[PDB]
Design a protein around this ligand. Structure first.
Ligand SMILES: [Cl-]
Length: 377
């Protein structure tokens, strides 16, 4: 038992449907399952019946609910919801031992937002105010937490893939959750958790694209996204290289597009067929980088006959930059060190691997002119 032991194993989820934490809202208490999303900045909860919701927030039963008399609308990559803003008391029973008055969006209508069978009823946007709706004046949850209490301005995520679970440690780091050393990359700007990717390798083979392409028009760390999403030119090069490294086997074109699944008989997946993938990230010292390496166990996602194990290729094309989603995060313990404007990676104690290969975090490397990689708006 480390000091943060009561926050260990506080996340649950279904594979590919996101990881959620229990949050208790209002008075008397209403506890809901809440998607942990480092790619957005609103705290919002289902607040009316929906066919995919087991429960929802009932404002009329909360004596401490305060109406802000303002509507709110959030479009996501393809889901959207509409609702009403207010504030209420919020605690995380398997999180920090504090209660805060936070902004909460009560979701009254939605389109393709709630996911049948996901078990979550709302979303906790952990990114910065810049990207909050309706605007940056709506204080996000984590900002409220830090302003109102002693809790240190840091949280960390261990997402354990392939019924999923994990840990969100709030206000610190738990050393049981990782092995080896933590390596940090700067948060380039406080909006999304924006980072800079400086090199990409597939089975040790450099893709050799200009680093500006890897970060066009941003690279972010996003726990609410399943895939590793890559800019079009990078995606095309990566697929070409992954195909070449997996030459022993042939797969249809649509498999690489995520439009076709390939299944193996139970327990026979030739993980060895597929290459490891490395992203080099900008380090904390001039001209210094480090690399994170994931396995096919991370980027080939099981889709749940019981004797067949089917997989989807979970690297996909993006037109809004690189997104380091669960495919990346499931290899690592990831420290969102807001106080020091940096994100840490270490090998996860829970990551899915085999007897031959493991995810890795290695450094240092020498990479020159990294200040040129970032996109400028
Ligand atoms: Cl605490």
């Amino acid at each position: 038992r480390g000091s943060f032991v009561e926050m260990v194993d506080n996340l649950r989820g279904k594979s590919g449907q996101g990881y959620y934490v229990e949050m208790t809202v209002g008075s008397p208490p209403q506890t809901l399952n809440i998607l942990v999303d480092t790619g957005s900045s609103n705290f919002a909860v289902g607040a009316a019946p929906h066919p995919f919701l087991h429960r929802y927030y009932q404002r009329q039963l909360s004596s401490t609910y305060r109406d802000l008399r303002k509507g709110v609308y959030v479009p996501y990559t393809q889901g959207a919801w509409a609702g009403e803003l207010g504030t209420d008391l919020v605690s995380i029973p398997h999180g920090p031992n504090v209660t805060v008055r936070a902004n909460i969006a009560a979701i009254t209508e939605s389109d393709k937002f709630f996911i049948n069978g996901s078990n979550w009823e709302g979303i906790l946007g952990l990114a910065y105010a810049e990207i909050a709706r309706p605007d940056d004046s709506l204080e996000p949850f984590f900002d409220s937490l830090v302003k109102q209490t002693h809790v240190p301005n840091l949280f960390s995520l261990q997402l354990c893939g392939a019924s999923v679970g994990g840990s969100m440690i709030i206000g610190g780091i738990d050393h049981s959750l990782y092995t080896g050393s933590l390596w940090y990359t700067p948060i380039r700007r406080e909006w999304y958790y924006e980072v800079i990717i400086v090199r990409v390798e597939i089975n040790g083979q450099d893709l050799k694209m200009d680093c500006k392409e890897y970060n066009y028009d941003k690279s972010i760390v996003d726990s609410g996204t399943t895939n590793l999403r890559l800019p079009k030119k990078v995606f095309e090069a990566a697929v070409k290289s992954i195909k070449a490294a997996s030459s022993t086997e042939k797969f249809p074109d649509g498999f690489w597009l995520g439009e076709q699944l390939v299944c193996w008989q139970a327990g026979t997946t030739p993980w060895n067929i597929f290459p490891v993938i490395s992203l080099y990230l900008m380090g904390e010292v001039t001209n210094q980088s480090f690399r994170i390496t994931i396995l096919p166990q991370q980027y080939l996602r099981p889709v749940e006959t019981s004797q067949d194990d089917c997989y989807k290729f979970a690297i996909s094309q993006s037109s809004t930059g690189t997104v380091m989603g669960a495919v990346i995060m499931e290899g690592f313990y990831v420290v969102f060190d807001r106080a020091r404007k940096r994100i840490g990676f270490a090998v996860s104690a829970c990551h899915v691997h085999d007897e031959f290969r493991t995810a890795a975090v290695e450094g240092p490397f020498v990479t020159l002119d990294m200040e040129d990689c970032g996109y400028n708006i």
